[PDB]
Amino acid sequence: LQGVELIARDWIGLMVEVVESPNHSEVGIKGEVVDETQNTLKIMTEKGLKVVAKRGRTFRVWYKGKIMRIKGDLINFRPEDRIKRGLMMLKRAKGVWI
């Protein structure tokens, strides 16, 4: 339910943590998203700033009392685009055809 909402919502302002990545040294990067583009997430960490690509990455995200794991491959699209994708994932997660 809420996990799907994250597919459509920009992640700016949310707390995230990189748990999987093809760029191995990125594991552990955790902080607040301060900017987002179709392909990247800019994160403010405890000791600095990091830019992390979305493709191939898996992020743990703190949202409305829950903690979800979301693949960057699902959100590396423009906002308008992510809105339609969000709805698709909702139908799929609802077992509804439309």
Q: Which residues of 51-81 are buried (b: 16+ CB within 10 A; e: fewer)?
A: ebbbeebbbebebeeeeeebebeebbbeeee
Find out whether 71 and 51 touch, Cβ atoms under 8 Å: no
Unique residue bearing structure tokens 């920009």: 10
Give CA 51 to chain center in angstroms: 13
Unique residue bearing structure tokens 């992510």: 82
Residue 65 to residues 1, 5, 17, 19, 72, Cα–Cα distance (Å):
13, 14, 16, 19, 21
Residue 45 to residues 13, 15, 42, Cα–Cα distance (Å):
13, 10, 10
Deposited resolution, Å: 1.7
The CATH architecture to which 1-98 belongs is: Roll (2.30)
∠ CA 84-35-66, rounded to 5°: 65
Find out whether 15 and 62 touch, Cβ atoms under 8 Å: yes
Rounded Cα distance between 77 and 40, Å, is 10
Residue 79 to residues 4, 48, 66, Cα–Cα distance (Å):
14, 27, 23
Unique residue bearing structure tokens 């994708």: 85
Give CA 88 to chain center in angstroms: 16
- By what method was this entry solved? X-ray
Q: Which DSSP string do the residues of 65-82 spell out, in sequence order?
A: TEEEEEEGGGT-S-HHHH
Within 8 A by CB and 6+ apart from 58, the residues are 18, 19, 20, 21, 69, 70, 71, 72
